[PDB]
Design a protein around this ligand. Structure first.
Ligand SMILES: Cc1cc2nc3c(=O)[nH]c(=O)nc-3n(C[C@H](O)[C@H](O)[C@H](O)COP(=O)(O)OP(=O)(O)OC[C@H]3O[C@@H](n4cnc5c(N)ncnc54)[C@H](O)[C@@H]3O)c2cc1C
Ligand SMILES: Cc1cc2nc3c(=O)[nH]c(=O)nc-3n(C[C@H](O)[C@H](O)[C@H](O)COP(=O)(O)OP(=O)(O)OC[C@H]3O[C@@H](n4cnc5c(N)ncnc54)[C@H](O)[C@@H]3O)c2cc1C
Ligand SMILES: COc1cc(OC)nc(Oc2cccc(Oc3nc(OC)cc(OC)n3)c2C(=O)O)n1
Ligand SMILES: COc1cc(OC)nc(Oc2cccc(Oc3nc(OC)cc(OC)n3)c2C(=O)O)n1
Ligand SMILES: C/C(NCc1cnc(C)nc1N)=C(/S)CCOP(=O)([O-])OP(=O)([O-])O
Ligand SMILES: C/C(NCc1cnc(C)nc1N)=C(/S)CCOP(=O)([O-])OP(=O)([O-])O
Ligand SMILES: C/C(NCc1cnc(C)nc1N)=C(/S)CCOP(=O)([O-])OP(=O)([O-])O
Ligand SMILES: [Mg+2]
Ligand SMILES: [Mg+2]
Ligand SMILES: [Mg+2]
Lengths: 583, 583, 288
């Protein structure tokens, strides 16, 4: 039962109703940045003894923190901003949450209802702006609509295919006195009728049938399996089917396991892409068949009967037509198939050892490889050292670029929700704030931000947030003095013609710029720089063993390229396994 | 005549067509941040020997720099970003440029045409998103449409009421070979028919008539007069009418002049608001009657015949009904009235000395005042010192908050386009990037960023941009360790109840946090901190006399309040002249 | 009710629009493409592998043939009053089912779909999704222009026919051999049927005649045709119906046949909205 701070017959501000509405949703943490149009909400937040506010130094840092909080917990992330400039600073995070299907609730202040559409002070039609980059949004036009809208907002954000929901609240609504009705029915009759029912036995038994008739089965696991870790692992034990994962699905199946083909796709391993290329059965669970993965669709799993399980019917048959499809929760689908696979185990006698050995061969000839030059630190090596010293149990948030790929290639994630990274939108500056939210959601966990020098500096102001909130956030900065990912394409497709990809100072080219250590020192965060590979192990260890925040500036040669690589719209035969930025 | 780098019969990439299209528009400077969907454009930029690119460390810094470039020159500002996260980082700047009517052209990369609407890699419906926060936008669907669209984009952004125009360019269009047609007619038949004609003699002679019949005339000058500095000054000489200016219109009429009532509005001077309150003739030139200025409309200039001149017919009669209106260029309207006022000078014999003396009285009893506590630095005093040492000829960009108001109150701007500040949207983090763009547009000018500790840290990453580009940007940081503006409202309207407005470290409360000096040192920018008022003069002098970038951390007591203040929706009788955050 | 629709069947869905595959029901097998090509592909497989497959669904067909015997499409004849169902089946016989049929929307639309055996596609022109009244007569015009040598008949209701009655002028001026088989029940039959069954026969503006002269057919649709120089006639007795329809066909050019039917007729069978097969209604009308 819930205990309010107000009498059931006592009127109170709409702002207080809003906060209590969050308390009834089990909200424990918000990321709010105050402003004139949201002061009432912030005032009401101080009256709450159950909701903690983490004040960012930028609303983009605020919404990205809400993502990290969400991605690393399964809970919805909540960020609050003021009208106008505050709201527009949330845009990237909203679009990011929609593309990666992250459960998130964003609340923005707004000018009074009578002042809407008058080009008023700090007024932005944020609903009109964010309609195409949110799952749903609301504009509260009455104080009595607050309890219903909030309940709907959290329901829409967390149910079905998770996503961002924005609620815009006019300032006069926040100030209006009212008595809230908490037991009013939600008004989403359309959405709920479209909600997928539990998978039928007929569809599940058809999948198991295809499995027994296949000789080269491959699991195509994505971000939809983040809550099906136990069920998926159980499924693999019963089938012995190798697992290829997406960027979003890392950790769903343990990467240190023998049956893990790791990641497939543009920068996926050679054997993962090989497995799908020559498969005769493709089990696509919780994926959306992105062109970063498939490449040229007509060649992607061309000889395989495709099984697609998704909770969004709009994704089933969009890019490729599946021979068997199940519209519903993959968690339930696995549970249903597991019981069938166990009671009929002796009858089926599944054994894909021949196929697994064929894949194990490819795993031997073409493994993930990097090269060591003298005492220069390989970015790949640094990440694998972090894996060993954290035993692969750390929560890893990243920016976007070369460092992002290496963080996905050279770290074996034991469990899901250790891997926090912008996949669909691929937004830089995501790493540091996401680490903040993850650390708040998981206080006792090892949280490390594997960032690039370009991505890190974008939201560097959040270092202040980290110190003030006393969060044990570790920052493993892979510094190549460049926008590496763009630089790589320049080397390979544009004859190494540099077009504004150098981030250092041309006046003093052999000096590391900027001095990221002084950024940390500005926020009272202990930091250090490592250049020699021999000094790397103790440096990373020091970062971990040192209590609280820490920044490790790892200097790497910028000539490194992410391998392997399948060019855009390319096939498996177009894979690139050699080459870098050196001559 | 223009000289291309390509033969008239030679095919070339759409990206090269785009860049040449900018060259033909006289573009000398762009603010572009590279990405996968805009690499072709950046490659084409390197082939240009006339277009300089200033690489920011964040696209928001990129678009804000384009604003400062535009606001301080009259030229359109050009910023370029990649698809998805790059585009969404421009949103705040686009909305900012629309509300303050700033001429700006934003170019964003986009996924291939065939991949649009497929939730593709880094895809954002930026046209759908920014339709309500831009003047116009485009989605290029053919390479041959590039020259026409670019010409229309610059035309729409600079003509009539200036504003932001976004052009979204799919990557496949950038790569497609074609031969551009530069002499094709623009397709804006509707917009051009609505373009205001030069003001008729009948309307102008009606205004002059009202002037001769008035005894208490007041000039209501705004951002629409930024190009009418000479004409306005000439108009004042012929009439002797006192000048009240908006936040956006500062500098249009010299503030050190005797007839200058400085700024009116919520935080406008007592005598400026008094003048409008008791006027019998209100000459509203280049204003939009914002509620920050008028307050309660029904009481704003209640006894005055109102003359409104605007280039946008949608603004004339929106909030208040004028007795006389002229839809057109205020520059031409002034030119027309000046010739009439001079040839009919001896016949009119205008003399508002009695009214001016009445205002001069109010100017004596209620002047702009601040208080000095011991050796603590008054933020107001620091700004007035900057005025004296720069002789009021410096370009001033600000963030948003208390420091923004004091920068507008205690600096006498001799000319327009010295004052760069977010007025309509009021976006924090605007100051530093705007200073960058202004410094690039005006290399020989003194550029100073009067920033707040909250606003400064939001886009602190642009300090790297300043050093790399070697820009003589001065940063006068008024540090109150708080979000002052919100804090002020807390003190006055919420019983000083702090709701996340403190920006320092609660663990070490008497220590200035963060150490902004180390932020500058990280980017190799010389910096210093001043605490005692006696040391302030030489400190500011040192900042100016030191070549190149410089950061001065000015520590001020946070108990200071911006005065005077008319509460929202209030009248002149509700003005607050006393009080601070002290007890 | 979707959950009960083909509940025990493995579903194969072939559509050229991927947005339709898996929208309402999840198919066990789906093909996104031209059904014409899908049939062509399956036909070649079914023929070369014919002796291997040996398909035979005679038992299932006999089970269905049984249901076809016990519950066939049925109507009732009252004295010499013309059954709308009978009139349409007569049109079928006299046109040998080769005529192009356009309809309005309502009871007459359903009977035109139930009691006419269409040999080929594109003989049946009717608003299905939107179900727009007044569609029949203009659609007949366009069909007659596209198919000059074809027998074009508009099976219309008195409500649907009058909505776009002005197109009778178009028919005469363009000299189109459009036949108009008007099933006149003096009501908005479809709405009237729901009134009888779900609202205790409470008439809510469904009568189209003149209350002042209730036993007179209103309006006189024959005069509508005469206004546009179109030969027309009215038939009331069932015995006179056969020669009347024959006259309509044998008469060159446009023709309007005003067929008067009792308004108490109901369209059968009927499964209520959101209902299942067990909820099917096989009996009942507007009579007491
Ligand atoms: C520089 C860069 C390079 C990249 N290269 C690669 C690469 O090489 N390989 C790669 O894989 N990615 C890569 N990406 C990321 C890529 O763009 C996408 O993020 C990813 O490919 C798509 O993830 P997904 O297929 O798992 O689907 P997701 O984006 O994770 O969406 C989840 C899907 O599962 C469904 N779903 C969700 N919940 C459930 C449930 N409970 N039950 C059933 N279904 C559910 C959803 O409806 C949705 O369709 C890269 C990104 C960047 C920035
Ligand atoms: C914290 C804060 C406090 C603020 N308080 C105040 C305050 O106290 N006082 C104040 O004044 N502002 C204040 N503002 C700013 C305020 O919100 C607006 O920016 C300002 O009041 C409106 O400017 P404006 O009236 O000059 O019109 P603008 O926004 O400058 O628009 C220009 C107008 O002139 C027209 N125009 C443009 N060009 C021409 C031309 N060539 N010929 C004719 N017409 C043209 C345009 O159509 C437009 O209508 C504050 C902002 C902030 C962030
Ligand atoms: C904390 O400092 C400031 C400063 C300021 O103006 C400079 N405004 C606000 O809050 C708003 C934010 C957005 C729009 C606003 O306009 C507004 N809001 C109202 O809500 C009660 C009423 C009102 O009547 C005119 N105008 C307001 C407003 O409070 O004036 N806060
Ligand atoms: C499949 O065919 C194509 C063709 C094309 O243009 C020729 N673009 C895309 O997708 C993108 C969408 C957005 C940015 C893109 O550039 C890009 N993509 C990367 O994918 C990880 C990385 C990267 O590093 C610079 N650039 C790309 C890109 O594939 O080039 N796909
Ligand atoms: C510019 C760019 N992409 C374009 C871009 C621009 N802006 C944003 C917000 N996001 C993206 N993805 C990348 S991945 C390079 C970033 O380089 P990095 O952060 O230093 O990492 P690394 O050099 O290891 O690739
Ligand atoms: C939070 C806020 N306004 C809400 C807000 C939030 N986010 C943005 C981008 N813009 C605004 N205007 C202000 S003015 C306080 C800023 O304080 P400051 O930058 O340190 O300046 P000062 O303390 O002198 O008022
Ligand atoms: C009112 C109605 N439906 C509502 C309606 C209203 N308006 C239009 C344009 N279309 C429709 N479908 C029907 S089906 C009754 C029409 O009666 P009818 O044209 O005389 O045919 P019948 O009486 O045999 O059902
Ligand atoms: Mg880098
Ligand atoms: Mg401050
Ligand atoms: Mg009828």
């Amino acid at each position: 039962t819930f205990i309010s701070r107000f009498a059931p017959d006592q009127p109170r501000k709409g702002a207080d109703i809003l906060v209590e509405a969050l308390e009834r949703q089990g909200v424990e943490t918000v990321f709010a940045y105050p402003g004139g149009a949201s002061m009432e909400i912030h005032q009401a937040l101080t009256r709450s003894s159950s909701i903690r506010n983490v004040l960012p130094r930028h609303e983009q840092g605020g919404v990205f923190a809400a993502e990290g909080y969400a991605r690393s917990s399964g809970k919805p992330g909540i960020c609050i901003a003021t009208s106008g400039p505050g709201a527009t600073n949330l845009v990237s995070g909203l679009a990011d949450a929609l593309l990666d299907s992250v459960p998130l609730v964003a609340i923005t202040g707004q000018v009074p209802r009578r002042m809407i559409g008058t080009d008023a002070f700090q007024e932005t039609p944020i609903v009109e702006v964010t309609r195409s980059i949110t799952k749903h949004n609301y504009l509260v036009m009455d104080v009595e609509d607050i309890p219903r809208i909030i309940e709907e907002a959290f329901f829409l954000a967390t149910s079905g295919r998770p996503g961002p929901v924005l609620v815009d609240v006019p300032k006069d609504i926040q100030q209006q006195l009212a008595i809230p009705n908490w037991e009013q029915a939600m008004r989403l009759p359309g959405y709920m009728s479209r909600m997928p029912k539990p998978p039928e036995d007929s569809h599940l038994e058809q999948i198991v049938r295809l499995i027994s008739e296949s000789k080269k089965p491959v699991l195509y696991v994505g971000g939809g399996c983040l809550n099906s870790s136990d069920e998926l692992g159980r499924f693999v034990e019963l089938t012995g089917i190798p697992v290829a994962s997406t960027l979003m699905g890392l950790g769903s199946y343990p990467c240190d396991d023998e049956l893990s083909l790791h990641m497939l796709g543009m920068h996926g391993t050679v054997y993962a892409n090989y497995a799908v290329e020559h498969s005769d059965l493709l089990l696509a669970f919780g994926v959306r068949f992105d062109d970063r993965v498939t490449g040229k669709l007509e060649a992607f799993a061309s000889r395989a009967k495709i099984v697609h399980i998704d909770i969004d019917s709009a994704e089933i048959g969009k890019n490729k037509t599946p021979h068997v499809s199940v519209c519903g929760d993959v968690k339930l689908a696995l549970q249903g198939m597991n019981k069938v696979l166990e009671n009929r185990a002796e009858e089926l006698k599944l054994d894909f050892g021949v196929w697994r050995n064929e894949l194990n061969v490819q795993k031997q000839k073409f493994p993930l490889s990097f090269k060591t030059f003298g005492e220069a630190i390989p970015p790949q090596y640094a990440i694998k050292v972090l894996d060993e010293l954290t035993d692969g149990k750390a929560i890893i948030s990243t920016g976007v670029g070369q460092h992002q790929m290496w963080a996905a290639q050279f770290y074996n994630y034991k469990k899901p929700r250790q891997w926090l990274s912008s996949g669909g939108l691929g937004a830089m500056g995501f790493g540091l704030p996401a680490a903040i939210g993850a650390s708040v959601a998981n206080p006792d966990a090892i949280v490390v931000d594997i960032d690039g020098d370009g991505s890190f500096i974008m939201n560097v102001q959040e270092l202040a947030t980290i110190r003030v909130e006393n969060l044990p956030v570790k920052v493993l900065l892979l510094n190549n003095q460049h926008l590496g990912m763009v630089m790589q394409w320049e080397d390979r497709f544009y004859k190494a013609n540099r077009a504004h990809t150098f981030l250092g100072d041309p006046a003093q080219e052999d000096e590391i710029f900027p001095n990221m250590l002084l950024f940390a020192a500005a926020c009272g965060i202990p930091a250090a720089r490592v250049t020699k590979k021999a000094d790397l192990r103790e440096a990373i260890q020091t970062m971990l063993d040192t209590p609280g925040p820490y920044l490790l500036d790892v200097i790497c040669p910028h000539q490194e390229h992410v391998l392997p690589m399948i060019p855009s719209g390319g096939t498996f035969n177009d894979v690139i396994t050699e080459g870098d930025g050196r001559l």
